[PDB]
Design a protein around this ligand. Structure first.
Ligand SMILES: Nc1ncnc2c1ncn2[C@@H]1O[C@H](COP(=O)(O)OP(=O)(O)OP(=O)(O)O)[C@@H](O)[C@H]1O
Ligand SMILES: Nc1ncnc2c1ncn2[C@@H]1O[C@H](COP(=O)(O)OP(=O)(O)OP(=O)(O)O)[C@@H](O)[C@H]1O
Ligand SMILES: Nc1ncnc2c1ncn2[C@@H]1O[C@H](COP(=O)(O)OP(=O)(O)OP(=O)(O)O)[C@@H](O)[C@H]1O
Lengths: 292, 353, 173
């Protein structure tokens, strides 16, 4: 082992101390909880039913599995253009799990020396196995999950090598059956094709553009705190939302407050809504002509 | 009450300081031993009369005094990661039957792996030298670490576990000398078996001259390749290797001698898919009606993994139906659909040879 | 007054930084929320000069200029530590601001066949957006983005969620 406590010239160990290491690698993230919850999002009830399934059923319903003889899922792929807003989904419901949760950034595994990210991930899954059950969320896997093609050289060949080491922690060793690890990627373009498995990436859900119902719903959730003059269609602007991301509905609210300021009006109005819509999308400008 | 005093008397013996390790380079005389510390400095010392001078020998791990810097006690060999290479565990045995195919590969590695151990006579009579190495590659299919894993836990004897990410070592690629020392302890516990997972990275081509990492990686590769170019008899040690793409592995590894055999996994035939589906239908409680040819007709080109995840997908979709025993109609639905989603995410499964 | 007559531009990119920073209580009253960050681009005239104006009219808390090329370095993984630790600094500097010029050099999207290529560029920019997508703060420090060409799309499809207030030049009246 290591860490055994010995005093200078004594070269004898009074006490054997644990545990492990190290600083940023030890604690990448220790999450109390983010305040948001699944009630703040809308339109995902089916895919958030799939998520709440994959994360919740090992926690409380493990007895059901042992009755049916079920192997629960581990890797669950999360993809879609923002937004979506899958990060608030995973971290919101992660705050609803009450179980141990560790955030992680994909490019963090890119390091200065050869294969530091390897011992990094091993330390991660070691503290995860210590805190079991737990949940680890990673994003931008495609940043470090591009296997390239052929030598030379993949500067991440060590990093993606550590990814294939995660596939070894999911391959040659079963114990990862506890502490489900969730992953998210904005684009599925590049992948390790071996990532398909129940212990690896299993439930894979496309996150589409929200629908006018869901768009006006979630945008109404962003504007529900602010003072709004009680005349809003949400139908008019719900149809006026075309190709919008839900995040651009947030931007519609934010702009509604912005010009709501310069107007001097104490309460938000519908002309302000359609105004901000025109503001963020679509862009500008040219001039009104030729179409009469 | 008195046992405590026994411990405290042990402390009186702990007033003796730990000695300093070292190696024996040569010996100039009986009172002049040419030694080196594991930390680098070299020394020449005499020693006491409790030694046997012939027992010393050059290249010997010894312990030295803190002042006289001379041998009192000595130990032959030590290695930290070895017992951890031996600590791998896998169930089966029976999983060696659970995997289904591939039969001729199963029996093939059983012969070239297990048979030189038990029966060197059959080989030494015909005049053929036993093959010392083999290669596995997925995921054109999959089951590499499964199959070979159940060979390690099947044949038992002595076996060594290696992940390619433990040879990183950061400074001073002496994980190379950990391959040397590791091969020496494989010569200690011989016969032994060697796993090699993800051999692409530790098999690279050094095609384009670049940076540092690639160069020292290639250096540890020179250690590997020249230790399979011996100058040594690797008959008693076995080596199993698995990687995604048999492309970047360089002609040195692709050359026989170093790597004698080449075996692959392929996408399971509907026969083997049928079988692995059978053994995956066992642990799951099912309704009285079961028809496997439905899933066999529907499921085509999956990995064995994708097939067992398809079974788990059936059951975990059936936790919504809340039924304990589940019909295979729900299995046809969820298995079929979600399986075809896996096939929409099945992009670029086509690998070299 | 060194502005060349651009008003709507200077008005929006002004109220987006001064007004929330000068009079924070105003928005807290009407809150809602002011947007995270902004974007500038167009022909060279005049880029980066209105930034100098933000320097002048800057009242109290300092702001950190960041040129585009100092992110990219050889021996990969350096610019990552860089951008991260400057974000930690800005989280120490309480309401201090950041500006980025020449972002089009480091935000080249998306990829090529191989071998890369964008992989260091990608991990640095996508890593930047990764720091941008954590819930905290984020950042109460705003940001500022000025470049030539609006491409590429990956940072431009990652901005509108967090960032906003994209304004274009204009160019002489
Ligand atoms: N369908 C939706 N329901 C609720 N909120 C949404 C929705 N779509 C967008 N948002 C909002 O958009 C904002 C921006 O989130 P964003 O889309 O950047 O997260 P994300 O895309 O999951 O993260 P990343 O960009 O790392 O993938 C969030 O604050 C979120 O509240
Ligand atoms: N022929 C098979 N029989 C039984 N299980 C299989 C078979 N092939 C694959 N699997 C399943 O695949 C999972 C991973 O084992 P395996 O050694 O195939 O990983 P791998 O080949 O390294 O995966 P990849 O090649 O995709 O990285 C195991 O849980 C195993 O149950
Ligand atoms: N509209 C304007 N108002 C005031 N000064 C201007 C204007 N247009 C150009 N100038 C002057 O012209 C000079 C050149 O413009 P500047 O170099 O600031 O743009 P730029 O830095 O080339 O833009 P970019 O950063 O996109 O390359 C500036 O010093 C500025 O004083």
């Amino acid at each position: 082992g290591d860490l055994v406590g010995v005093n200078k010239d004594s070269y004898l160990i009074l006490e054997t101390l644990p545990t492990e290491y190290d600083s940023r690698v030890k604690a990448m993230e220790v999450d109390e909880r983010p305040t948001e919850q699944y009630s703040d999002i809308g339109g995902l009830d089916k895919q958030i039913q799939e998520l709440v399934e994959a994360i919740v059923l090992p926690m409380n319903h493990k007895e059901k599995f042992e009755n049916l003889g079920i192997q629960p899922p581990k890797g669950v792929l999360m993809y879609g253009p923002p937004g979506t807003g899958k990060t608030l989904l995973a971290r919101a419901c992660a705050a609803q799990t009450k179980a141990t949760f560790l955030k992680l950034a994909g490019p963090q595994l890119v390091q200065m020396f050869i294969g530091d990210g390897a011992k990094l991930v091993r330390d991660a899954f070691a503290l995860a196995k210590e805190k079991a059950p737990s949940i680890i969320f990673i994003d931008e896997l495609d940043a470090i999950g591009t296997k390239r093609f052929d030598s030379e050289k993949a500067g991440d060949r060590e990093v993606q090598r550590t990814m294939l080491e995660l596939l070894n922690q999911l391959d040659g060793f079963q114990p990862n059956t506890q502490v489900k690890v969730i992953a998210a990627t904005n684009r599925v373009d590049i992948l390790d094709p071996a990532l398909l498995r129940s212990g690896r990436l299993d439930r894979k859900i496309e996150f589409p553009m929200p629908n006018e119902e869901a768009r006006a719903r979630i945008m109404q959730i962003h504007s529900r705190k602010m003072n709004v003059s009680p005349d809003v269609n949400y139908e008019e602007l719900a149809r006026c939302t075309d190709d919008f991301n839900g995040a651009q509905c947030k931007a519609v609210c934010v702009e509604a407050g912005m010009i709501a300021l310069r107007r001097g009006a104490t309460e938000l109005t519908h002309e302000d809504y359609m105004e901000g819509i025109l503001e963020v999308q679509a862009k500008k400008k040219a001039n009104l002509q030729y179409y009469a | 009450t008195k046992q405590y005093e026994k411990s405290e008397n042990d402390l009186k013996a702990l007033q003796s300081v730990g000695q300093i390790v070292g190696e024996v380079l040569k010996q100039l005389t009986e009172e002049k031993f040419i030694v080196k510390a594991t930390n680098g400095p070299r020394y020449v010392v005499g020693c006491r009369r409790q030694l046997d001078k012939s027992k010393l020998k050059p290249g010997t791990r010894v312990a030295l005094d803190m002042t006289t810097l001379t041998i009192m006690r000595y130990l032959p060999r030590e290695v930290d990661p070895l017992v951890y290479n031996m600590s791998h565990e896998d169930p089966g045995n029976v999983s060696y039957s659970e995997i289904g195919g591939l039969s001729e590969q199963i029996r093939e590695l059983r012969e070239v792996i297990e048979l030189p151990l038990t029966n060197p006579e059959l080989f030494q009579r015909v005049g053929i030298i036993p093959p010392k190495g083999c290669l596995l590659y997925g995921p054109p299919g999959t089951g590499k670490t499964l199959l070979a894993r159940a060979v390690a836990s099947q044949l038992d004897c002595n076996f060594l576990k290696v992940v390619s990410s433990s040879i990183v070592d950061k400074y001073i690629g002496e994980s190379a000398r950990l391959i040397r020392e590791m091969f020496n302890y494989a010569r200690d516990h011989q016969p032994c078996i060697i796993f090699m997972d993800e051999i692409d990275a530790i098999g690279g081509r050094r095609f384009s001259e670049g940076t540092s990492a690639d160069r020292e990686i290639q250096r540890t590769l020179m250690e590997l390749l020249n230790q399979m170019d011996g100058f040594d008899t690797l008959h008693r040690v076995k080596m199993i290797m698995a990687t995604n793409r048999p492309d970047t592995l360089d002609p040195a590894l692709l050359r026989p001698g170093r790597l004698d055999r080449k075996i692959h996994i392929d996408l399971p035939n509907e026969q083997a898919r049928l079988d692995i589906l059978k053994i995956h239908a066992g642990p799951i409680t099912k309704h009285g009606e079961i028809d496997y040819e439905a899933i066999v007709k529907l499921s085509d080109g999956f990995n064995g993994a994708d097939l067992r995840n398809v079974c788990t997908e059936a059951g975990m979709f059936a936790i919504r139906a809340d039924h304990d025993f589940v019909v295979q109609e729900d299995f046809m639905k969820a298995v079929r659909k979600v399986a075809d989603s896996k096939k929409l995410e099945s992009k670029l499964d086509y690998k070299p040879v | 007054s060194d502005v060349g007559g651009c008003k709507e531009q200077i008005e929006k990119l002004r109220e987006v930084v001064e007004t929330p920073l000068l009079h924070p209580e105003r928005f807290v009253n009407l809150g809602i929320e002011p947007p995270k960050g902004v974007l500038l681009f167009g022909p060279p005239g005049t880029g980066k000069t209105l930034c100098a104006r933000a320097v002048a009219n800057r009242t109290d808390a300092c702001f950190i200029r960041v040129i585009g090329s100092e992110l990219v370095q050889k021996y990969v993984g350096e610019g990552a530590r860089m951008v991260r630790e400057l974000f930690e600094m800005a989280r120490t500097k309480k309401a201090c601001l950041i500006f980025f010029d020449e972002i089009d050099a480091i935000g080249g999207a998306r990829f090529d066949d191989g071998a890369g290529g964008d992989n260091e560029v990608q991990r640095t920019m996508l890593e930047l957006i990764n720091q941008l997508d954590g819930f905290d703060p984020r950042g109460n420090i705003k940001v500022l983005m000025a470049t030539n060409r609006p491409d590429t799309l990956d940072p431009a499809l990652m901005r509108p969620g967090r960032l906003d207030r994209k304004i274009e030049f204009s160019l002489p009246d």
